[model samples]
Target: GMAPPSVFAEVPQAQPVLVFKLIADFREDPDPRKVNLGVGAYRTDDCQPWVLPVVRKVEQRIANNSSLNHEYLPILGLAEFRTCASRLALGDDSPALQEKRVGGVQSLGGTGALRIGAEFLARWYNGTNNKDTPVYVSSPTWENLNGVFTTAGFKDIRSYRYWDTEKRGLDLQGFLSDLENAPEFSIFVLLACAHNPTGTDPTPEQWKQIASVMKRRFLFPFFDSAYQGFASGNLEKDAWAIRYFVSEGFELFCAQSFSKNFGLYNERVGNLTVVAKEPDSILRVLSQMQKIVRVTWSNPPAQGARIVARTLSDPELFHEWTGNVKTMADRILSMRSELRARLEALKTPGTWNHITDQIGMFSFTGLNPKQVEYLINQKHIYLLPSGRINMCGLTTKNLDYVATSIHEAVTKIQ
Candidate 1:
């Protein structure tokens, strides 16, 4: 026994996950003025997590219902949730829906949806040759994009030009060039709306251009639609890109998350929707997805799916949910305006237009690593070293302090 070595003794230490590490560091800080811009969740004006009023009402109703039970859902997930979720993204009038060509499965979250989709494609797509298929994601996308695909056995993961550093906007030329040059049948992971981190999204016209290029190249689209109604306060508008692609006769995969939109982050509710050329093909595709899900998570959780399904299926509740979504979206939009205005008022050195120009919960501040370090060390502000800040972290109470800290960082740091 003394001569035996432990099999796990050689394990190496790994760095802490970035976002969670930031949260932990923020928690330990004693500074009353500390701002946690690294958090990705939605926060109210008082910097507290907001649970949607509609969700509260639905939970009350569910609790009161005596018939409800804690039972496992089918391998495909809550039927009504899957149907409504797909309809919400594709619209009731979608040609795909009309043709009955869309099928969906419940997932743990957007991340889970991505994983299941990637795994299914890895095994089934191209009939065993998918390992060599090129996977393209936006530069500086959500950190897990590359990891999810790579873990699924994809060998060629690449980044397409997305953000333009100098202009602090979309790098359209580079983005288009990359798409045009990519190999046919390459998989492109597109953010449906309110792109994460950078917060920049293509305009409707630009979307058309992108679609044309994608169509010509025969690229496959894997849309990560986590924001949806949370992005623009309008579900239909946020889903326009996905709808357009479907209209253009493209067979696509969409990963939809109810986390941010419904404030169901912890429940891990997501749906993976597959659109195919024909109804029979959709059936076949979803059958394979269920097999992947069976071994991965067994079955999706029930609570989040029930909440989303109830909200979406009931017109009255759906309307209330929309209002709640608009409340969050409007607050974020106002914060963007307030931040840009404060920066301009303080005579901050760089262009501040991008602050308001960006949408959703994040703004990729033009602050370099030195400026970010100054903010973190001197001002107790927490954000990514890339200078991405969750705009929800800005509130009326601390907006001025944050703006002042940015001014100092910009003026003092390189």
Candidate 2:
């Protein structure tokens, strides 16, 4: 083990993880209508991988139950899947869950609920009565949230001015002047609504004026909500900015992710809530989040938290799983309004109106990584050399062949 340590022997030239290099060259390109749109999962307006007929009737009601068990789920998982993922992310009449003040657990999904909320915000918001304090992310986020806060030691990680690039969307005065100049219990990561890659979300009167100037600069509102019902599939209108930051009384931490809203991809399931103001600090924060889930990943995977606690404890199967999450968010909003009306019916110069004013399940398609490899080399069409597609992999018979293969790879290939 020591002979190979010559300072990692000039280690370089390996950066090509461009979304697993277009999913391993589109699975070794045998080309059958070669269109990948680089993996943000969920597809089917005839693309595929959808399942949710109430998740195959709750996986045939947990495999025709005999009180199902494979054992082990209590390193803080499955107390009825953390009380139905804390009443579906704190709101079965949440006055902080009617005064129990909320604490939750269940993980290994929204990327292990963002690494157990960055190790429970590095042990209770370490506002450092000495050392370790800093968190803020968003000059574009979710590239595994920048190595999950630098592998969770989180050395003062930073980023601000949330998206502007010639006013395509919310740079809200450079995000309220970088949350009024950061540092004051500074923890920021908040893409709770659609906003992944760049599908910008704010309004509910701009998340109550950025939760009232982040509750007068205390800031820590770390949320990542991983597209609840894939944005506007109307799971409470994509949980209107975490129910308007819990009706603006913010003591937040939500990280839930039924892996793209209950498709439960490979069933990793996830959740990590903690909204305390008292109720004995939600039982001393779920007993130190069960020793950080007994030192990471000890228990998280009881059949996708029992198929998301049978769709967050049925009310007519949670209204038939929000009617299959609004039919896959109205078929990715009709493939972003016909891929911006078939690239403006072929005129395609610019202003693809943020591809129908962006909402979710991915959209930073403003292309260019040599025009997404000139639309996969003269149009076999795969995406993401940071062109980030997956608007539920656009359909209506490939939406005018993906808007004429992105207007011939952005105006007749270079």
Candidate 3:
């Protein structure tokens, strides 16, 4: 009698799913020792969910202040937050910021920022130039990229070489060859740093090589910067690639997320930054983007943006918060070092070097899906079936348990 769920299902040929949910349904699992490493959320040294100290301080500050309003924010979001976000990203003294040429609107973290960015590209690119081009993403990209662009009205979407399964690192040669052979004048989504899933990042030399190739190919590199300081505890270093591309004069687009580093996971704070070739052209382009944002969310959420902006902009708070970021990063880094050492001590088969070689909050354990499942069903160690594990989930308390379980699983199976 009523509209069936499948009534609209016909319009959805490709359904969207976050890889994290594959583990979410396991949280209520009765197994007392169940350990979930599927999602990217963090836990403390005591195996408790960690709220960044700065985040806790801010949340308390907001709750008790009582003076804040729930007033409707502009569709473009809060002005202070928006400006602070752009400045936080491009550096306060960036020529583009000073010239008021770079334009942006606060958005719902990196995903929202990506969606708006894709829409901006789709509307203009499809209706104007390259009426049939697709956004080229990494072959094994963040699960959402394809859907984001397609939903934004892009006609064709594709991927290029990225991870080498055998080498368990960036397939640079394959990537370079692909870029050399790819259709010219297309948008390429890049993992600025701390690439998700694989956790394998390219060296500075490799980044420069990529930049050189893109410069030669005139390929637009759309950056999704969700990890930033979380990857290395060095915000400036993590931001090097995006900064490099901007300085190299690419009409670049970036989606900035504050979720991980700031522990503002649900705050839905992010921005879409557009950098143009010329001062005048930047202004015109930003105006058009503002128009798109104007219609998209009518604005973005304010609380998270305000908190992130304040934490990033104020010198004392920024320093304090950056230290907190370092704490989280150091924890993940220590886990990597610790795990690899344990593996080596056990004389575990295989090089196991990649365990420590990889950097970031996550690691690709290189375990096959069957081994991953065996770890879950038999050992109660839950990780993404794809072999990705959130290193933040490891701590002094559980690290040994998890590592031993992994060693047992691999040794028995491998």
Candidate 4:
């Protein structure tokens, strides 16, 4: 009786986040052999969430600190975190940092960093206010890119061609063509490493050509580097693209998420690193970004950032953390081989090379929707309808079953 139904009638129901819905449904299922590959978070072979050994040690240290307080962090977040994260992304002796031309602000996570960066760019960047500021994202990019920018008030949204559906690989020519034709000064999002959904990425030469095209176009690059050390098991290798862009003297912004790499998914620790050509302009960008932080989150949380800062600041902990990353990466890489091997042994209908060829946590299985449905309903395995599976979800215990089920789905379903 107290509800005002008429006032809320026009609003439509929002679509649920499919991954979370899948997780919820899986929780209610009684099957003992159920496999869930729908979400991006990392899981051990035992199918448990991983807390990095370094993370546990650092947590103990933070917990035992008598001086620690529950006070809110400043809008810019923990200072040590900002510096360490910026250095991690841009390198310790980056010319931009040396020249004081770079600034960092703490963000909720990669998504929040994107939203805040979008909001700041939408308001402050040149050529944005004339209503011609179109933002270009990669086709088959992380799904949130569309919602983040559109809701941030950018009107014209476009996509640069990415993965080739026909070849099931990088469509390098189409990708470059799209970049070449984009309007001057428009924003373009680049996945710094470990391209999502498709799991394919451009080679070094290809990336150089991309940097060349962007330089010629006078376009702005907004990098969403979520995986970092998680990709290829080497932080330096994963950061090559961004560092190269910087070496070319491109002034840009990078959104860095520590969620996957640090296994701190729920902590929401992230940083937005802004690179400007001059010291004078860097401060201007930082000021506006700070204002957004103040209004949007009031203050960034400290627990995760403090842990990250401590780990990064200590050589032993840093080395230990990198080792943990390697362990996880090797497990995923091994699973890729194991899954592909079993599929081949089972004489699966399609080529399974892509399983090993694709990099990072996801492998675009090239299985059609009906085949995916068969895996879900018939085989009790779950993944995105596009046949994207988190490689981390597959373990030694379940690999055989998953491979056999996939084979059955493809050959038997259609």
The lDDT per prediction is: 0.92, 0.78, 0.79, 0.88
Better of 3 and 4 by TM-score: 4
- What tens-digit string does per-residue lDDT give for candidate 2 at 71-118? 787888878778778677666787888888888888888778778778
lDDT of 4: 0.88
Choose 3 or 4, whichever is better by lDDT: 4
**Candidate 2 lDDT trough over 10 residues, lowest sum:** 123-132
Rank order (by TM-score, best first) = 1, 4, 3, 2
TM-score of each: 0.98, 0.36, 0.91, 0.95
Ranking by lDDT: 1, 4, 3, 2
Model 2's alpha-carbon lDDT is 0.78
State the weakest 10-residue window (summed lDDT) of model 4: 123-132
Question: Who wins the lDDT comparison?
Answer: 1
Name the TM-score of candidate 4: 0.95
